[PDB]
Amino acid sequence: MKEIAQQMRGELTQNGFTSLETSEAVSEYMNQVNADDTTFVVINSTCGCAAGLARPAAVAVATQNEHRPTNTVTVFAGQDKEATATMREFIQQVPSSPSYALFKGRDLVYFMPREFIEGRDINDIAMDLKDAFDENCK
Amino acid sequence: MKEIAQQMRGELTQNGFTSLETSEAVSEYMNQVNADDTTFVVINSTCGCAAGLARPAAVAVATQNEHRPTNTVTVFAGQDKEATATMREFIQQVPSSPSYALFKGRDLVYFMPREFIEGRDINDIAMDLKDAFDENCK
Ligand SMILES: *SC[C@H](N)C(=O)N[C@H]1[C@@H](O[C@@H](CC(=O)O)C(=O)O)O[C@H](CO)[C@@H](O)[C@@H]1O
Numbered sequence: 001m002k003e004i005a006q007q008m009r010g011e012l013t014q015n016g017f018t019s020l021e022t023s024e025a026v027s028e029y030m031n032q033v034n035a036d037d038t039t040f041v042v043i044n045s046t047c048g049c050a051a052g053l054a055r056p057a058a059v060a061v062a063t064q065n066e067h068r069p070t071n072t073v074t075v076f077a078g079q080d081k082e083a084t085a086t087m088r089e090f091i092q093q094v095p096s097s098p099s100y101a102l103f104k105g106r107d108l109v110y111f112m113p114r115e116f117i118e119g120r121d122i123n124d125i126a127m128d129l130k131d132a133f134d135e136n137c138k
Numbered sequence: 139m140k141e142i143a144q145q146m147r148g149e150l151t152q153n154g155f156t157s158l159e160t161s162e163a164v165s166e167y168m169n170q171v172n173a174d175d176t177t178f179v180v181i182n183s184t185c186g187c188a189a190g191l192a193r194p195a196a197v198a199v200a201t202q203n204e205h206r207p208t209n210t211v212t213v214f215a216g217q218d219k220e221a222t223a224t225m226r227e228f229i230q231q232v233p234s235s236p237s238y239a240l241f242k243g244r245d246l247v248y249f250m251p252r253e254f255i256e257g258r259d260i261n262d263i264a265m266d267l268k269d270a271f272d273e274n275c276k
């Protein structure tokens with residue numbers, strides 16, 4: 001589980017995502033974003049099939065789309081509990097994992113819960129992310 | 139699908155795996171391995187939950203175990219059909235994807251079919267790979 005979680009985290013950090021692993025790191029990051037920037041958050045997970053769908057879609061769209069988020073960050077639900085709880089204070093939605101959140105400044109503009117990922121074709125998940133970035137990112 | 143497949147391939151090539159994407163590349167690689175070396179093959183896939191389980195387990199064990207394969211390579215079933223068919227000529231097993239193969243020289247010593255991956259905890263998949271490398275790799 002140790003090496004597995006680091007690989008699942010590495011899938012994101014090897015492709016531009018900043019890993020926020022303490023409550024303090026989340027507060028320091030989210031309370032310092034510029035009001036006009038967009039921040040894409042992947043809430044990672046180790047278990048089930050949904051987690052394996054969420055990582056590739058997020059990496060592919062957030063790094064290749066024309067309209068891309070200013071910032072890409074991740075918290076790891078289950079593994080980094082305090083970081084995940086603090087991020088969820090900014091999101092203010094029903095908690096689930098994996099899940100996606102998109103911010104403009106500190107305001108949530110898009111949220112995808114676990115139930116919209118589970119059992120969904122990876123190409124369709126990527127398409128929703130493309131739509132959300134196109135509507136909200138410069 | 140284009141960007142998605144490259145991310146799923148990149149998960150392996152960003153962590154030491156050689157991507158073999160033509161029939162010629164597979165023949166040239168497998169027909170040139172040393173008789174005493176071990177070659178771990180990940181047959182990648184874009185679809186279903188099994189594919190998302192197979193990648194992290196393979197990366198974590200093949201790069202972190204004490205006993206590690208000499209060579210790590212991958213063919214992408216569906217995406218690179220000719221490469222996958224040629225690799226399957228060396229494997230000589232029922233075809234499935236995702237699947238794992240381990241060679242000593244050109245002789246198959248371990249095989250894991252899709253049906254042993256689908257619905258399996260990722261930690262248990264990693265454990266079988268650890269056992270197979272421990273038994274067969276220096
Ligand atoms: S996948 C099996 C897993 N133990 C689980 O039940 N996950 C659910 C759980 O996730 C939490 C982290 C964890 O892996 O335990 C979390 O998100 O904090 O709870 C959420 C919310 O109910 C579910 O979406 C997960 O499936």
Ligand SMILES: *SC[C@H](N)C(=O)N[C@H]1[C@@H](O[C@@H](CC(=O)O)C(=O)O)O[C@H](CO)[C@@H](O)[C@@H]1O
Binds near residue numbers: 215
């Ligand atoms: S996951 C849905 C997919 N279309 C599929 O049916 N995969 C099966 C298929 O895989 C081939 C590549 C592909 O994605 O089409 C392949 O491995 O060459 O066939 C194999 C063998 O029967 C199955 O193990 C896959 O689930």
